mmCIF file of C-alpha atoms and ligand atoms in Angstrom:
data_model
loop_
_atom_site.group_PDB
_atom_site.id
_atom_site.type_symbol
_atom_site.label_atom_id
_atom_site.label_comp_id
_atom_site.label_asym_id
_atom_site.label_seq_id
_atom_site.Cartn_x
_atom_site.Cartn_y
_atom_site.Cartn_z
ATOM 1 C CA UNK A 259 20.353 49.654 66.361
ATOM 2 C CA UNK A 260 18.944 53.012 66.159
ATOM 3 C CA UNK A 261 20.287 55.465 63.421
ATOM 4 C CA UNK A 262 19.717 58.719 62.584
ATOM 5 C CA UNK A 263 16.573 60.297 62.233
ATOM 6 C CA UNK A 264 13.952 57.716 63.997
ATOM 7 C CA UNK A 265 16.143 54.916 61.309
ATOM 8 C CA UNK A 266 17.105 51.265 62.375
ATOM 9 C CA UNK A 267 19.108 48.647 60.847
ATOM 10 C CA UNK A 268 19.870 45.458 62.149
ATOM 11 C CA UNK A 269 24.020 46.079 62.063
ATOM 12 C CA UNK A 270 24.643 49.161 64.166
ATOM 13 C CA UNK A 271 27.559 49.735 61.188
ATOM 14 C CA UNK A 272 24.957 50.045 58.712
ATOM 15 C CA UNK A 273 23.654 53.588 60.253
ATOM 16 C CA UNK A 274 26.585 55.637 58.661
ATOM 17 C CA UNK A 275 24.953 54.723 55.400
ATOM 18 C CA UNK A 276 21.501 56.689 56.286
ATOM 19 C CA UNK A 277 23.908 59.754 56.763
ATOM 20 C CA UNK A 278 25.715 59.332 53.814
ATOM 21 C CA UNK A 279 22.595 58.852 51.779
ATOM 22 C CA UNK A 280 20.956 62.053 53.132
ATOM 23 C CA UNK A 281 24.211 63.641 51.751
ATOM 24 C CA UNK A 282 24.728 62.265 48.446
ATOM 25 C CA UNK A 283 20.573 62.838 47.604
ATOM 26 C CA UNK A 284 20.176 66.458 48.591
ATOM 27 C CA UNK A 285 23.615 67.421 47.591
ATOM 28 C CA UNK A 286 25.827 65.537 44.540
ATOM 29 C CA UNK A 287 22.365 64.324 43.520
ATOM 30 C CA UNK A 288 20.797 67.444 43.783
ATOM 31 C CA UNK A 289 17.497 66.558 45.496
ATOM 32 C CA UNK A 290 17.290 62.194 44.687
ATOM 33 C CA UNK A 291 17.630 63.321 40.945
ATOM 34 C CA UNK A 292 18.654 61.205 38.411
ATOM 35 C CA UNK A 293 20.795 62.997 36.407
ATOM 36 C CA UNK A 294 24.380 63.487 35.243
ATOM 37 C CA UNK A 295 25.906 62.951 38.729
ATOM 38 C CA UNK A 296 23.810 59.948 39.036
ATOM 39 C CA UNK A 297 24.680 58.475 35.755
ATOM 40 C CA UNK A 298 28.451 59.047 36.365
ATOM 41 C CA UNK A 299 28.486 57.353 39.350
ATOM 42 C CA UNK A 300 26.923 54.599 37.960
ATOM 43 C CA UNK A 301 29.727 54.231 35.228
ATOM 44 C CA UNK A 302 32.205 54.438 37.700
ATOM 45 C CA UNK A 303 31.080 51.578 40.165
ATOM 46 C CA UNK A 304 31.955 49.183 36.375
ATOM 47 C CA UNK A 305 35.218 51.060 36.055
ATOM 48 C CA UNK A 306 36.662 50.223 39.694
ATOM 49 C CA UNK A 307 35.177 46.607 40.022
ATOM 50 C CA UNK A 308 36.217 45.796 36.286
ATOM 51 C CA UNK A 309 39.745 45.920 37.259
ATOM 52 C CA UNK A 310 39.490 42.397 38.296
ATOM 53 C CA UNK A 311 41.468 39.372 36.330
ATOM 54 C CA UNK A 312 41.516 35.832 37.548
ATOM 55 C CA UNK A 313 43.680 35.169 34.360
ATOM 56 C CA UNK A 314 46.078 37.253 35.341
ATOM 57 C CA UNK A 315 47.007 35.997 38.562
ATOM 58 C CA UNK A 316 46.882 32.241 37.265
ATOM 59 C CA UNK A 317 49.814 33.786 35.122
ATOM 60 C CA UNK A 318 51.430 34.688 38.230
ATOM 61 C CA UNK A 319 50.488 38.764 37.701
ATOM 62 C CA UNK A 320 48.549 41.118 40.087
ATOM 63 C CA UNK A 321 45.182 40.505 38.276
ATOM 64 C CA UNK A 322 43.388 43.758 40.222
ATOM 65 C CA UNK A 323 41.650 43.997 43.129
ATOM 66 C CA UNK A 324 37.794 44.523 41.678
ATOM 67 C CA UNK A 325 35.541 46.829 43.524
ATOM 68 C CA UNK A 326 37.978 47.699 45.819
ATOM 69 C CA UNK A 327 38.420 52.025 45.493
ATOM 70 C CA UNK A 328 41.458 51.687 43.754
ATOM 71 C CA UNK A 329 40.230 54.010 40.933
ATOM 72 C CA UNK A 330 39.692 56.595 44.010
ATOM 73 C CA UNK A 331 42.922 56.267 46.012
ATOM 74 C CA UNK A 332 44.793 55.515 42.882
ATOM 75 C CA UNK A 333 43.101 58.555 40.864
ATOM 76 C CA UNK A 334 46.665 59.800 39.460
ATOM 77 C CA UNK A 335 47.313 56.310 37.844
ATOM 78 C CA UNK A 336 44.257 54.910 36.996
ATOM 79 C CA UNK A 337 41.931 57.887 35.463
ATOM 80 C CA UNK A 338 44.672 57.834 33.285
ATOM 81 C CA UNK A 339 44.441 54.926 31.562
ATOM 82 C CA UNK A 340 43.278 55.457 28.118
ATOM 83 C CA UNK A 341 39.651 53.420 28.941
ATOM 84 C CA UNK A 342 39.277 55.577 32.004
ATOM 85 C CA UNK A 343 38.680 58.952 30.203
ATOM 86 C CA UNK A 344 36.134 61.389 31.278
ATOM 87 C CA UNK A 345 36.034 59.461 34.880
ATOM 88 C CA UNK A 346 38.289 61.847 36.887
ATOM 89 C CA UNK A 347 35.369 64.629 37.259
ATOM 90 C CA UNK A 348 33.340 62.448 39.390
ATOM 91 C CA UNK A 349 35.827 60.792 41.195
ATOM 92 C CA UNK A 350 37.250 63.767 42.523
ATOM 93 C CA UNK A 351 33.594 64.899 43.437
ATOM 94 C CA UNK A 352 33.189 61.500 45.495
ATOM 95 C CA UNK A 353 36.705 61.257 46.790
ATOM 96 C CA UNK A 354 36.448 63.953 49.825
ATOM 97 C CA UNK A 355 32.789 63.199 50.302
ATOM 98 C CA UNK A 356 33.834 59.302 51.234
ATOM 99 C CA UNK A 357 36.642 60.892 53.319
ATOM 100 C CA UNK A 358 34.450 63.223 55.029
ATOM 101 C CA UNK A 359 31.997 60.500 56.516
ATOM 102 C CA UNK A 360 34.856 58.588 56.560
ATOM 103 C CA UNK A 361 33.868 55.597 54.793
ATOM 104 C CA UNK A 362 35.739 53.120 52.726
ATOM 105 C CA UNK A 363 36.333 54.438 48.720
ATOM 106 C CA UNK A 364 35.149 51.099 47.551
ATOM 107 C CA UNK A 365 32.137 50.931 49.515
ATOM 108 C CA UNK A 366 31.132 54.511 48.509
ATOM 109 C CA UNK A 367 31.856 54.115 44.975
ATOM 110 C CA UNK A 368 29.110 51.444 45.278
ATOM 111 C CA UNK A 369 26.670 52.726 47.420
ATOM 112 C CA UNK A 370 26.435 55.918 45.097
ATOM 113 C CA UNK A 371 25.853 53.781 42.179
ATOM 114 C CA UNK A 372 23.022 51.837 44.241
ATOM 115 C CA UNK A 373 21.250 54.978 45.928
ATOM 116 C CA UNK A 374 21.324 56.861 42.034
ATOM 117 C CA UNK A 375 20.269 54.213 40.091
ATOM 118 C CA UNK A 376 17.300 53.969 42.487
ATOM 119 C CA UNK A 377 16.187 57.555 41.323
ATOM 120 C CA UNK A 378 15.590 56.494 38.146
ATOM 121 C CA UNK A 379 11.917 56.345 37.040
ATOM 122 C CA UNK A 380 11.470 52.659 37.039
ATOM 123 C CA UNK A 381 14.940 51.865 38.488
ATOM 124 C CA UNK A 382 16.481 48.768 40.274
ATOM 125 C CA UNK A 383 17.197 48.299 43.879
ATOM 126 C CA UNK A 384 20.882 47.378 44.184
ATOM 127 C CA UNK A 385 22.093 44.803 46.555
ATOM 128 C CA UNK A 386 24.417 47.252 49.251
ATOM 129 C CA UNK A 387 26.914 45.327 50.794
ATOM 130 C CA UNK A 388 29.443 47.674 53.402
ATOM 131 C CA UNK A 389 33.112 46.694 54.616
ATOM 132 C CA UNK A 390 35.845 46.818 51.493
ATOM 133 C CA UNK A 391 39.400 47.998 52.783
ATOM 134 C CA UNK A 392 41.191 51.003 51.361
ATOM 135 C CA UNK A 393 44.507 48.703 51.495
ATOM 136 C CA UNK A 394 44.981 47.719 47.849
ATOM 137 C CA UNK A 395 46.888 48.580 44.644
ATOM 138 C CA UNK A 396 46.190 49.863 41.197
ATOM 139 C CA UNK A 397 44.753 48.124 38.756
ATOM 140 C CA UNK A 398 46.465 46.897 35.727
ATOM 141 C CA UNK A 399 46.244 48.580 32.887
ATOM 142 C CA UNK A 400 43.754 47.490 29.906
ATOM 143 C CA UNK A 401 41.022 45.628 31.765
ATOM 144 C CA UNK A 402 37.949 48.395 30.735
ATOM 145 C CA UNK A 403 36.581 47.536 27.789
ATOM 146 C CA UNK A 404 36.729 50.008 25.395
ATOM 147 C CA UNK A 405 34.123 51.044 23.089
ATOM 148 C CA UNK A 406 36.066 49.961 19.715
ATOM 149 C CA UNK A 407 36.699 46.813 21.189
ATOM 150 C CA UNK A 408 34.894 43.671 19.268
ATOM 151 C CA UNK A 409 31.999 41.590 20.673
ATOM 152 C CA UNK A 410 34.834 38.601 20.997
ATOM 153 C CA UNK A 411 36.953 40.665 23.145
ATOM 154 C CA UNK A 412 34.296 42.288 25.577
ATOM 155 C CA UNK A 413 33.133 39.076 26.135
ATOM 156 C CA UNK A 414 36.223 37.551 26.740
ATOM 157 C CA UNK A 415 37.067 40.595 28.793
ATOM 158 C CA UNK A 416 33.961 40.385 30.566
ATOM 159 C CA UNK A 417 34.027 36.659 31.124
ATOM 160 C CA UNK A 418 37.429 36.678 33.001
ATOM 161 C CA UNK A 419 36.169 38.913 35.437
ATOM 162 C CA UNK A 420 32.609 36.489 36.100
ATOM 163 C CA UNK A 421 30.466 37.581 33.534
ATOM 164 C CA UNK A 422 28.558 35.398 30.951
ATOM 165 C CA UNK A 423 26.964 37.101 27.924
ATOM 166 C CA UNK A 424 23.701 37.128 29.391
ATOM 167 C CA UNK A 425 25.119 39.340 32.235
ATOM 168 C CA UNK A 426 26.984 41.368 29.743
ATOM 169 C CA UNK A 427 23.680 42.554 27.832
ATOM 170 C CA UNK A 428 21.901 42.870 31.543
ATOM 171 C CA UNK A 429 24.911 45.251 32.730
ATOM 172 C CA UNK A 430 24.622 47.401 29.832
ATOM 173 C CA UNK A 431 20.578 48.371 30.693
ATOM 174 C CA UNK A 432 22.622 51.051 32.613
ATOM 175 C CA UNK A 433 23.076 53.060 29.213
ATOM 176 C CA UNK A 434 19.330 53.322 29.509
ATOM 177 C CA UNK A 435 20.357 56.112 31.859
ATOM 178 C CA UNK A 436 23.313 57.151 30.276
ATOM 179 C CA UNK A 437 25.707 59.784 27.999
ATOM 180 C CA UNK A 438 28.831 60.857 26.436
ATOM 181 C CA UNK A 439 31.088 63.020 27.114
ATOM 182 C CA UNK A 440 34.818 62.217 25.963
ATOM 183 C CA UNK A 441 33.992 60.283 22.427
ATOM 184 C CA UNK A 442 32.888 63.434 20.944
ATOM 185 C CA UNK A 443 33.255 66.359 23.632
ATOM 186 C CA UNK A 444 31.336 69.091 21.424
ATOM 187 C CA UNK A 445 28.385 66.431 21.939
ATOM 188 C CA UNK A 446 28.601 66.001 25.300
ATOM 189 C CA UNK A 447 25.555 65.008 26.979
ATOM 190 C CA UNK A 448 23.963 63.270 24.479
ATOM 191 C CA UNK A 449 21.804 60.172 25.697
ATOM 192 C CA UNK A 450 22.283 56.330 24.339
ATOM 193 C CA UNK A 451 18.578 56.395 24.649
ATOM 194 C CA UNK A 452 15.783 58.657 24.104
ATOM 195 C CA UNK A 453 14.831 58.535 28.239
ATOM 196 C CA UNK A 454 18.044 58.921 30.184
ATOM 197 C CA UNK A 455 15.942 59.524 33.411
ATOM 198 C CA UNK A 456 13.922 56.277 32.967
ATOM 199 C CA UNK A 457 15.617 52.626 33.066
ATOM 200 C CA UNK A 458 13.769 51.033 30.651
ATOM 201 C CA UNK A 459 13.960 49.328 27.698
ATOM 202 C CA UNK A 460 14.086 52.213 25.131
ATOM 203 C CA UNK A 461 17.990 51.626 24.907
ATOM 204 C CA UNK A 462 17.755 48.079 23.200
ATOM 205 C CA UNK A 463 15.055 49.593 21.253
ATOM 206 C CA UNK A 464 16.707 51.990 19.793
ATOM 207 C CA UNK A 465 20.095 50.783 19.610
ATOM 208 C CA UNK A 466 18.515 47.935 16.848
ATOM 209 C CA UNK A 467 17.281 50.905 14.628
ATOM 210 C CA UNK A 468 19.358 51.577 11.249
ATOM 211 C CA UNK A 469 22.070 53.844 11.935
ATOM 212 C CA UNK A 470 21.446 57.012 9.852
ATOM 213 C CA UNK A 471 22.820 60.185 10.952
ATOM 214 C CA UNK A 472 26.476 62.195 12.129
ATOM 215 C CA UNK A 473 25.207 64.001 14.697
ATOM 216 C CA UNK A 474 28.209 66.447 14.688
ATOM 217 C CA UNK A 475 30.688 67.328 12.408
ATOM 218 C CA UNK A 476 32.016 63.969 11.967
ATOM 219 C CA UNK A 477 32.311 60.855 13.668
ATOM 220 C CA UNK A 478 34.830 59.542 16.266
ATOM 221 C CA UNK A 479 36.760 56.650 17.379
ATOM 222 C CA UNK A 480 33.930 54.158 19.067
ATOM 223 C CA UNK A 481 31.285 56.015 17.655
ATOM 224 C CA UNK A 482 28.607 54.946 14.711
ATOM 225 C CA UNK A 483 25.361 56.452 13.411
ATOM 226 C CA UNK A 484 22.670 57.503 15.426
ATOM 227 C CA UNK A 485 19.060 56.811 14.455
ATOM 228 C CA UNK A 486 17.285 59.630 15.776
ATOM 229 C CA UNK A 487 18.136 63.273 16.523
ATOM 230 C CA UNK A 488 20.073 63.983 20.205
ATOM 231 C CA UNK A 489 20.619 60.163 20.663
ATOM 232 C CA UNK A 490 24.842 58.835 20.451
ATOM 233 C CA UNK A 491 25.449 55.616 19.490
ATOM 234 C CA UNK A 492 28.185 53.465 20.447
ATOM 235 C CA UNK A 493 30.449 51.001 18.214
ATOM 236 C CA UNK A 494 30.057 48.317 20.697
ATOM 237 C CA UNK A 495 26.803 48.805 21.525
ATOM 238 C CA UNK A 496 25.635 48.850 18.123
ATOM 239 C CA UNK A 497 27.698 45.225 17.099
ATOM 240 C CA UNK A 498 26.488 43.355 20.781
ATOM 241 C CA UNK A 499 22.641 44.358 19.877
ATOM 242 C CA UNK A 500 23.296 42.443 16.471
ATOM 243 C CA UNK A 501 25.701 39.438 17.255
ATOM 244 C CA UNK A 502 24.658 36.071 17.645
ATOM 245 C CA UNK A 503 26.258 35.483 21.054
ATOM 246 C CA UNK A 504 24.336 38.176 22.555
ATOM 247 C CA UNK A 505 21.197 39.518 20.183
ATOM 248 C CA UNK A 506 18.520 37.071 21.620
ATOM 249 C CA UNK A 507 18.837 38.694 25.261
ATOM 250 C CA UNK A 508 19.547 41.947 23.758
ATOM 251 C CA UNK A 509 15.757 41.571 22.201
ATOM 252 C CA UNK A 510 14.778 39.683 25.261
ATOM 253 C CA UNK A 511 14.645 43.120 27.167
ATOM 254 C CA UNK A 512 12.249 43.994 24.880
ATOM 255 C CA UNK A 513 9.786 41.077 24.696
ATOM 256 C CA UNK A 514 10.537 41.078 28.686
ATOM 257 C CA UNK A 515 10.808 44.511 30.106
ATOM 258 C CA UNK A 516 9.500 43.138 33.426
ATOM 259 C CA UNK A 517 13.057 41.208 33.646
ATOM 260 C CA UNK A 518 15.542 44.331 33.184
ATOM 261 C CA UNK A 519 15.431 45.397 37.014
ATOM 262 C CA UNK A 520 15.604 41.700 38.372
ATOM 263 C CA UNK A 521 18.584 40.733 35.839
ATOM 264 C CA UNK A 522 20.447 44.047 36.379
ATOM 265 C CA UNK A 523 20.143 43.598 39.976
ATOM 266 C CA UNK A 524 21.298 40.274 40.045
ATOM 267 C CA UNK A 525 24.390 41.254 37.304
ATOM 268 C CA UNK A 526 25.374 44.633 39.640
ATOM 269 C CA UNK A 527 24.973 42.579 43.050
ATOM 270 C CA UNK A 528 27.997 40.152 41.388
ATOM 271 C CA UNK A 529 29.622 43.267 40.077
ATOM 272 C CA UNK A 530 29.794 45.265 43.480
ATOM 273 C CA UNK A 531 31.987 42.425 44.701
ATOM 274 C CA UNK A 532 34.598 41.073 42.251
ATOM 275 C CA UNK A 533 37.549 41.311 44.449
ATOM 276 C CA UNK A 534 35.473 40.770 47.388
ATOM 277 C CA UNK A 535 33.872 37.820 49.593
ATOM 278 C CA UNK A 536 29.931 38.916 50.585
ATOM 279 C CA UNK A 537 30.192 36.664 53.984
ATOM 280 C CA UNK A 538 32.974 38.761 55.196
ATOM 281 C CA UNK A 539 30.910 41.973 54.196
ATOM 282 C CA UNK A 540 27.826 43.288 55.853
ATOM 283 C CA UNK A 541 24.385 43.690 54.123
ATOM 284 C CA UNK A 542 23.344 47.209 54.526
ATOM 285 C CA UNK A 543 20.576 46.933 51.435
ATOM 286 C CA UNK A 544 17.868 48.197 53.198
ATOM 287 C CA UNK A 545 19.391 51.678 53.467
ATOM 288 C CA UNK A 546 19.100 51.718 49.423
ATOM 289 C CA UNK A 547 15.741 53.780 48.775
ATOM 290 C CA UNK A 548 12.913 51.790 47.266
ATOM 291 C CA UNK A 549 12.689 52.990 43.359
ATOM 292 C CA UNK A 550 9.130 54.376 42.123
ATOM 293 C CA UNK A 551 7.560 54.311 38.694
ATOM 294 C CA UNK A 552 6.226 51.541 36.632
ATOM 295 C CA UNK A 553 7.559 48.927 34.234
ATOM 296 C CA UNK A 554 6.867 51.015 30.483
ATOM 297 C CA UNK A 555 5.945 49.778 27.568
ATOM 298 C CA UNK A 556 8.547 49.864 25.069
ATOM 299 C CA UNK A 557 7.486 51.841 21.819
ATOM 300 C CA UNK A 558 9.046 52.920 18.555
ATOM 301 C CA UNK A 559 10.006 56.443 18.096
ATOM 302 C CA UNK A 560 8.056 58.687 16.482
ATOM 303 C CA UNK A 561 8.621 58.550 12.552
ATOM 304 C CA UNK A 562 10.253 55.092 12.850
ATOM 305 C CA UNK A 563 8.972 51.643 11.813
ATOM 306 C CA UNK A 564 9.542 48.078 12.077
ATOM 307 C CA UNK A 565 11.066 48.487 8.901
ATOM 308 C CA UNK A 566 14.051 50.455 10.239
ATOM 309 C CA UNK A 567 14.997 47.717 13.019
ATOM 310 C CA UNK A 568 17.497 45.260 12.061
ATOM 311 C CA UNK A 569 15.961 41.970 13.981
ATOM 312 C CA UNK A 570 18.977 40.059 14.823
ATOM 313 C CA UNK A 571 17.830 37.518 16.978
ATOM 314 C CA UNK A 572 17.645 34.137 14.791
ATOM 315 C CA UNK A 573 14.958 32.061 17.165
ATOM 316 C CA UNK A 574 12.180 34.996 17.883
ATOM 317 C CA UNK A 575 11.116 37.812 15.907
ATOM 318 C CA UNK A 576 11.468 41.308 17.141
ATOM 319 C CA UNK A 577 8.026 42.212 19.155
ATOM 320 C CA UNK A 578 5.222 43.917 18.196
ATOM 321 C CA UNK A 579 5.771 47.451 19.702
ATOM 322 C CA UNK A 580 2.996 50.667 19.635
ATOM 323 C CA UNK A 581 4.410 53.300 17.925
ATOM 324 C CA UNK A 582 4.722 56.689 18.997
ATOM 325 C CA UNK A 583 2.329 59.195 16.987
ATOM 326 C CA UNK A 584 3.665 62.125 15.024
ATOM 327 C CA UNK A 585 6.866 63.693 14.710
ATOM 328 C CA UNK A 586 10.203 63.077 16.216
ATOM 329 C CA UNK A 587 11.315 65.694 18.656
ATOM 330 C CA UNK A 588 14.938 66.188 19.075
ATOM 331 C CA UNK A 589 16.185 64.341 22.540
ATOM 332 C CA UNK A 590 17.474 66.825 24.532
ATOM 333 C CA UNK A 591 20.841 66.529 26.266
ATOM 334 C CA UNK A 592 21.551 65.560 30.028
ATOM 335 C CA UNK A 593 21.784 68.628 31.924
ATOM 336 C CA UNK A 594 25.176 69.030 34.133
ATOM 337 C CA UNK A 595 27.276 71.660 36.268
HETATM 338 C C1 HEM B 702 30.315 46.279 28.451
HETATM 339 C C2 HEM B 702 31.266 47.215 28.045
HETATM 340 C C3 HEM B 702 30.778 48.692 28.096
HETATM 341 C C4 HEM B 702 31.527 49.286 26.902
HETATM 342 C C5 HEM B 702 32.286 49.216 25.999
HETATM 343 C C6 HEM B 702 30.826 50.638 27.548
HETATM 344 C C7 HEM B 702 31.451 52.186 27.033
HETATM 345 C C8 HEM B 702 30.803 53.307 27.530
HETATM 346 C C9 HEM B 702 31.361 54.365 26.886
HETATM 347 C C10 HEM B 702 32.110 55.084 25.576
HETATM 348 C C11 HEM B 702 30.571 55.361 27.668
HETATM 349 C C12 HEM B 702 30.602 57.422 27.379
HETATM 350 C C13 HEM B 702 32.096 57.540 28.389
HETATM 351 C C14 HEM B 702 32.187 59.269 27.301
HETATM 352 O O1 HEM B 702 32.559 59.511 26.511
HETATM 353 O O2 HEM B 702 31.607 59.751 28.717
HETATM 354 C C15 HEM B 702 29.546 54.681 28.496
HETATM 355 C C16 HEM B 702 29.359 55.871 29.367
HETATM 356 C C17 HEM B 702 28.320 55.105 30.527
HETATM 357 N N1 HEM B 702 28.743 53.718 30.938
HETATM 358 FE FE1 HEM B 702 29.224 51.966 29.333
HETATM 359 N N2 HEM B 702 29.951 50.521 28.901
HETATM 360 C C18 HEM B 702 30.357 49.464 29.377
HETATM 361 C C19 HEM B 702 29.374 48.588 30.381
HETATM 362 C C20 HEM B 702 28.979 49.339 31.214
HETATM 363 C C21 HEM B 702 29.031 48.967 32.539
HETATM 364 C C22 HEM B 702 28.844 47.310 32.665
HETATM 365 C C23 HEM B 702 27.906 50.248 32.978
HETATM 366 C C24 HEM B 702 27.632 49.840 34.800
HETATM 367 C C25 HEM B 702 26.859 48.863 34.874
HETATM 368 C C26 HEM B 702 28.043 51.142 32.404
HETATM 369 C C27 HEM B 702 27.556 52.343 32.820
HETATM 370 C C28 HEM B 702 27.947 53.543 32.059
HETATM 371 C C29 HEM B 702 26.779 54.589 32.183
HETATM 372 C C30 HEM B 702 26.127 54.626 33.389
HETATM 373 C C31 HEM B 702 27.297 55.827 31.247
HETATM 374 C C32 HEM B 702 26.790 57.339 31.174
HETATM 375 C C33 HEM B 702 28.248 57.980 31.661
HETATM 376 C C34 HEM B 702 27.866 59.713 31.891
HETATM 377 O O3 HEM B 702 26.255 60.014 31.620
HETATM 378 O O4 HEM B 702 28.373 60.505 31.654
HETATM 379 N N3 HEM B 702 28.539 50.837 31.013
HETATM 380 N N4 HEM B 702 30.043 53.355 28.956
HETATM 381 CA CA1 CA B 703 39.436 48.333 41.139
HETATM 382 CA CA1 CA B 704 16.023 55.106 29.095
#
């Protein structure tokens, strides 16, 4: 079928997504940038989708509808869940965009995440399926993992939703393009790695460094010491990098950086369709832009050495990496407005 601006798609019902693409790229994402709005949009895909629990369903309780737009339609309820702190900003920005284009909240949330991530240097090109219904119910509370949850708790929660430990690690490649706002509000915008617009392996490297710094006046719930000026570290990321259930796969994205994009893409296709049947949706994947940027060689930060890495994979040593020359420059906070 013929879409706008000389574009085409096998399925006429994908054509609307080209118009949503143009709008969110030019406006929400300020000209195709991998900045704040993209980071928030990518986080939102998880906070919508993870509200899904077969365990609750089998005990005769509502388990959540997964990737169903519930966090948006029922934003009054869901954004007041503790685990959903700092989410309403992006939800209230996206809501009128989805309404104006008359696309479903669930589809829009996943679309904004897929388009957004494709703008990041070396980013993924996530599968995009359309057709999720708005008719659903608010997610139960306590289904979103928290940064102070144990690795046992996180893996069990993610396992219930459908993800193996390796897949949890893959999904956390998202933290390569990511900052915090609510754990330590005064340090809003301090990112989880040195390259928050580059979909690279620096997150996996830098979380394995020894925690040495309290960046603000104190530590806060869900935070641990960071290894570099300007960086923020989550307690969960630190535990996951070191825990024997996950440490080898954590290190695998450093030993084999080319695997990060394909494994993230596969895990995200799954997460974006929680509570849905793909065979009853339509495939509009071709609307997602092709990402640009080569796979980067992960490097140790300036002034750090291999002694600063807390290597945690029993079966295989940490890979030999180059070390950046000179002294370390504080990592810039992510802009936002
Ligand atoms: C597995 C357990 C996870 C935990 C405990 C966790 C925890 C967190 C926390 C505490 C923040 C900072 C929130 C704030 O204070 O502003 C954050 C940010 C973020 N999360 Fe995760 N997360 C998890 C998994 C994921 C997944 C699966 C995704 C998506 C694939 C994701 C995407 C993001 C992104 C893109 C940000 C940055 C948001 C921004 O820049 O404002 N996270 N996460
Ligand atoms: Ca949901
Ligand atoms: Ca990065």
